[model samples]
Target: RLTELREDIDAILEDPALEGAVSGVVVVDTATGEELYSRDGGEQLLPASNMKLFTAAAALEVLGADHSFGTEVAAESAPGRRGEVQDLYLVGRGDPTLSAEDLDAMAAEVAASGVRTVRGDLYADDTWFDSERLVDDWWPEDEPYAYSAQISALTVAHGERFDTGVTEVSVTPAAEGEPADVDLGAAEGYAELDNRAVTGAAGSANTLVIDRPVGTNTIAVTGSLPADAAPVTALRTVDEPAALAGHLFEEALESNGVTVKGDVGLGGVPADWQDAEVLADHTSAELSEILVPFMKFSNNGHAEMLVKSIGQETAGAGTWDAGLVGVEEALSGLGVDTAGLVLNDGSGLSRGNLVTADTVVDLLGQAGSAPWAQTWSASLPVAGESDPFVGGTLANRMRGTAAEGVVEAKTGTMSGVSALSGYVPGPEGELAFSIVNNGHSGPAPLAVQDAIAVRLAEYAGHQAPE
Candidate 1:
């Protein structure tokens, strides 16, 4: 069995498809921490989103399963018969899940609490983290895409859905002569749209493009919509998430029958905020629930948010250095070697981050012994599952294979890097593995990586092959 596995791996390396590709692979028995197979496993390379495994583990361990974020609504003054808050403050604690619906619910809660009007500004308190939104080594041009959404202590989402930093815009074709209609699902008062779409022939192709210029709030939409065609959505990460939060919150307050007679601004929460009466507030989902989508979808915003939260919780400062200090401490508790494991950002978007298969495998093996191991394992993207929450990025991969629905893994993808690490059931019980490719452009490396997982799944521990 050992010979078969090694030979198969060697053949994959020699395949014409992987010429000059840098590959690393390691597999170890989770039950005993014994190395079953190893090849350049100690080589440090870019780990991409596999870094999320570290963030997720560290966060769950440090923050605990029941931890929750608070979005506070406070008033500068007490209410009257037609209840009024002199100044309504919406203070955020780095929550990435605050949506328009959440604000709406909060507004309704305020209405129920007898808050009918705001006498002053609707202020946004987002001082939890520093103003550094862009991570190191990330290109500035990526700002317009949903993946590169800005980080803010106070932010807004399209709906109650938890994917961070994006407001999804859907476009659908209308009648033959009518223009294409736009729908900003649950996202309001953020971007101004410049629609130049007109319905084309029924069989014509839809060439619509929705682009928000870098550092601008106007969304330029220019394209031809195919008449009566299917609708498509494009997600745009907001440029000013703090402002977006304030505006949407105001909208929610107004919709919920609370009137604000003053401007909405971004400012600090008063020193005496604790003494103020609570008008409305939102408590985010627990850390366990957040981790599910955080790992499954590889949401960078959530990772960053956790990093800041870790910093604030552990070091009393919300800077990246402070957050990483807590993360390192947590990783050390998991027996992950701290030597040479330099992490720049919680998300794998930073090319500056580096890790070795040995470290990753060791971490995965140690996870089995963690008190919260089940929650961590459940957060990994599972294969062959259709539900995005259950299967996530790996939902469509490994189907019909021996490892189908059995591989719970984290996948990392970059311009020249690819990595997959997690646990899979084998004939030898279960194993932890890591496969990272640093320099590959073709699809062949993926198949080679998948083959290794399948081979491990088919392993017959301490038994002769038939």
Candidate 2:
């Protein structure tokens, strides 16, 4: 039965559309551990975003499903008269889920803390984790992109540079339908802002693109905005994590009534400095929830932070090497043989990472039975019918057709790598599978890969468990 299914899948793999492509497929029963069909499934290939499966699994195992990352605002010494403090420190313990709303809330809480102003500088103490911006060997062009930001336990909107542009003001005359004057303040490096805003046009749509130079920090933005509009500020890139941390801390403190007089800066925890009050300690569980967004959206910052946290938890350090070791250890514990796996960073942004289809399939199968399986699976985007842009090639072709809604998986892609790994529902119920295509020639290769998945799902629907 398995041979027959494999043969059928091979026919799809042989499709002319898949020319210059390599593919691996595997189908297994979820109820009983059984491999129904497999093709080169043990061969290793670049997993791309599919790498998130390992990340999600490790996070769930180490950090429980009910986790929340917390940001700590502590005072080295109590505030004196007039809301003055000896030192105000904002510490980050690797909380990826901290959002703007959360920051706002924190600000409100600070205001409620009886702090009105500060006489000292705002010190952003991210010493809990190492300071490294951008994984080594990442493509230079990727820096200006949102995914290029460094992952810190303390980050806002994944650390994209935010500022205002000319979209906020009108430049034309009032009676003659004056246009709005655009003002874009201080765009970040590796990004450029092109404001072509017009005034007196209500409900007009605005367009902006943050472009990164091939090998430099300079960025350019080309887009239009309404005239006389408020400066439209979009996050360009996070060049300096330490600077961002300082800014965020100032905002958080100012909202709470604590005003700092000096510059915000990053510093290491002094050796002699005693451990003061535990203002906050973000639990592993809370950080796990944030990993969902990191995996689901392919947020590089979150992945980096998670990787760093993993290293910090297991190796007493959050360096890249330690994080990779931590990830390997976690996977080894889950019965995965990491012989071919190479992880440069958690988000798989670097082409250095490699994994086999069998490894992904095994990992997904095991994760399906874990306690945080629902959260892990739910983070993946479903293939929608006939939706080309968001759905990719797998959209509508195999979904709901073979064991409707059973295929919950993550997709991966890069220059020449394409992969899919997750659950597939069939007549025999749920099955975990993984298919990877490396060295593809063109777009058609992706379509061919999708066809292979659809056919395998169909075959699994008819075949009995091995």
Question: Which tens-of-lDDT digit does each residue in 269-292 have in candidate 2?
Answer: 455657643333333335445544
Best by lDDT: 1
Worst 10 residues of 2 by lDDT: 161-170
- Could you tell me the TM-score of candidate 2? 0.80
Q: What pairs collide in candidate 1? A: none
- For each candidate in turn, the TM-score is 0.93, 0.80
Who wins the TM-score comparison?
A: 1
Candidate 1 per-residue lDDT over residues 1-466, each given as its tens digit? 6677778767766766566777778888787666778889878889999988888888988889889988888886568786867888888888878877888999898889898888788888888877778786788777778667777787774443476667788888888778788865434466777777778898888788888877777677778888857888888776667877888888888898989899987887788666777777888889988888789888888888889889989987777889888988999987888785788988888889999988888889877888888888999988667888888888887777766778889988887788889988756678888998887766636777777766666673322123
- Cα RMSD for candidates in order: 2.7, 5.9
Off by over 4 Å in 2: 1-4, 158-209, 212-219, 222-235, 269-272, 275-288, 385-404, 456-466
Q: Which ten residues in a row have the lowest lDDT in candidate 1?
A: 457-466
